[PDB]
Amino acid sequence: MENFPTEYFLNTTVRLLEYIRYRDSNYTREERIENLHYAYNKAAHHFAQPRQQQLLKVDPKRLQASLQTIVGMVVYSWAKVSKECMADLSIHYTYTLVLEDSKDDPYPTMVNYFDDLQAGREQAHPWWALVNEHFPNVLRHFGPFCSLNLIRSTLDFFEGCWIEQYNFGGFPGSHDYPQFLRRMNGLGHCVGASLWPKEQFNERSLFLEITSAIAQMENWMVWVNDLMSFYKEFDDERDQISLVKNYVVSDEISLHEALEKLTQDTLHSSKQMVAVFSDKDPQVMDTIECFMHGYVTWHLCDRRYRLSEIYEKVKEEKTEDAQKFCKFYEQAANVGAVSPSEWAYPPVAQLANV
Amino acid sequence: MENFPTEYFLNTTVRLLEYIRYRDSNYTREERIENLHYAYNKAAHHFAQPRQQQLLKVDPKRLQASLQTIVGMVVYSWAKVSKECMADLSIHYTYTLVLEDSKDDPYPTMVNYFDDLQAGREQAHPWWALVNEHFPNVLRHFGPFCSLNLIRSTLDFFEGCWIEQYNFGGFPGSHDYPQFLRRMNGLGHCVGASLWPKEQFNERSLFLEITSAIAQMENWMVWVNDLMSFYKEFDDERDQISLVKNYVVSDEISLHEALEKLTQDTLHSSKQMVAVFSDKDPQVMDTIECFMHGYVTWHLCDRRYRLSEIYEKVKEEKTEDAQKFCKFYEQAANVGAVSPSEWAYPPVAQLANV
Ligand SMILES: [Mg+2]
Ligand SMILES: [Mg+2]
């Protein structure tokens, strides 16, 4: 065990929130609860169906916890899209999160992937069978271009998980490996492109804005998640391959140098996010800003990241960063700290049983 | 009005060839001619069929020229694969090259992409109809993992061309745009995974080296092409958007700074290629080395890049670069300089007419 870079972590986090202009919004707590319940309720009913229960090998409690985590991420980050769109994206991003629970070799189920796809025969791999069957409910919210992005990113993700099963951090000297893997399973183009429902944006009219957002949001989104996750992943001997840990193994640098690298990229990405979009179409900048703020709010509130622990340790320090941090945290809490009992019910297992 | 940095271009090129250990091989001129003709002959017959002629909107001379360029690229770089594999890969990489020609908005033909795909209905876009129908002939040479990589990369390429139609170099400040676009249309994972036919390599036994090769080869391959083809490019502004030009517009740097960036990446990529694989499975390193050398040999010989011009105007210099350069060039010429009349016949149009 090494000591956590609390000071360096608080500083980076604060700079991050300042760079993205983290601030209050009109998105109220009551509206969040309303959206959380709607999104959760439709998804829960979906995963509670016999077919879904039968083909999706997942521990019931893990499913319950995965669904609640994803519903939160979607509702808090895709703040500007309809309830239905939040619901359908919640189902999709829950399928992706759940695929990481499989240790099963994809090889045998992928031997006839293309031929079955071309012929329109159900896929051998159960996950593909469920996800492709459900996909139209996600794709109906987007134009052809954005849809293509969601389809590719998800295919990329499937290959990402396949690779993850080898718990390989890259060969020493394989500098290009880390980010290659991080893009493969980051779902960067899925997220980036799902921010533009055809009912709110015109894909052809904003093609350049959207394409640029996809390109830039891909890296901002995965790097921010890597950073916010750094605290929970620090002493987790079970989590052996992450962007930071692969930087260490592949680039042969220290965990600190690896963390610096991640920090420089994240901050620079944030800085350029604002510079590029602040003066563009107002609604495009709004969706982008609300996603960044929501995404951060979500990491701060979801127990999974345990950022509450950092808070408690530094809430009495009179340092500049410690102060700035606790403030942002408190802001997130006021609108985002919500008890699951207020929206996540009944449990999926209960609906499946009935 | 500007000047080709020649002096520097020679230096970079020489360092590149030295870094990758450019040297003679057992791959003889007669063997190349034998492969060129076999690959060309099968592809020419393919593209000459009524269905292919009818759905593939391409100027006959462009098709003839694209086919000859690709067959060369494949035969010289995938030196270790069977004749049949060279032929089928040539057909696929010719389809991709030809797609860069389309000026037609993909939007209307992609509105029902997923639903048609899921249902097994022929795609609305004629290119997809042809490429997907032919794909099995390419995929039969590979295991499920490599196949997945070819499929994804090709799907990415289709999106890449869609974006290319906007001739957009990225917003100033959108630092992540350039390489996002370059990977999108580089076919990096398609090339990198097609280097491992299941008849020569075992995808499960060499999963880690293959995955690593895909990750590293993706960047080496596109960057080397960007450097080599930087010549046939500033002269013209019909291809105004390129990695180097997008660096200029997006990063707001000078064409020279952009070129320096590309050079540092290309050399660093080459250096790491050798470091990582030189001591791994001998056969893996051989395929990787033969591809790099072949790929370079191909750029030096194919008229499309006009590197002969850089030659003539330097054969009488006395630099420690101009000298090194002409030497390598001459080496390439001895085994690669081949007259089309020796293998590319009869012309596709002739076979289509018959
Ligand atoms: Mg081109
Ligand atoms: Mg080029």
Curated annotation (Swiss-Prot), chains A, B:
Disulfide bonds: none annotated. It is an enzyme of class 4 (lyase). GO terms for molecular function: metal ion binding; trichodiene synthase activity. Transmembrane segments: none annotated. This is Trichodiene synthase. Pfam families: TRI5. Residues 100-104 are annotated as: Aspartate-rich domain. Some of the cofactor binding sites show unusual localization within the protein. It comes from the Eukaryota. Optimum pH is 6.75-7.75. Mg(2+) 2 binds at N225, S229, E233. Trichodiene synthase; part of the core gene cluster that mediates the biosynthesis of trichothecenes, a very large family of chemically related bicyclic sesquiterpene compounds acting as mycotoxins, including T2-toxin. The biosynthesis of trichothecenes begins with the cyclization of farnesyl diphosphate to trichodiene and is catalyzed by the trichodiene synthase TRI5. Trichodiene undergoes a series of oxygenations catalyzed by the cytochrome P450 monooxygenase TRI4. It catalyses: (2E,6E)-farnesyl diphosphate = trichodiene + diphosphate. Changing N225D: Increases the KM for farnesyl diphosphate by about 6-fold and reduces the kcat by about 28-fold. Leads to complete loss of activity. Induction: Expression is positively regulated by the trichothecene cluster-specific transcription activator TRI10. Expression is induced between 18h and 21h growth on GYEP medium. The initial detection of trichothecenes occurs several hours after the initial detection of TRI5. The initiation of trichothecene biosynthesis occurs with a high concentration of glucose remaining in the culture medium.
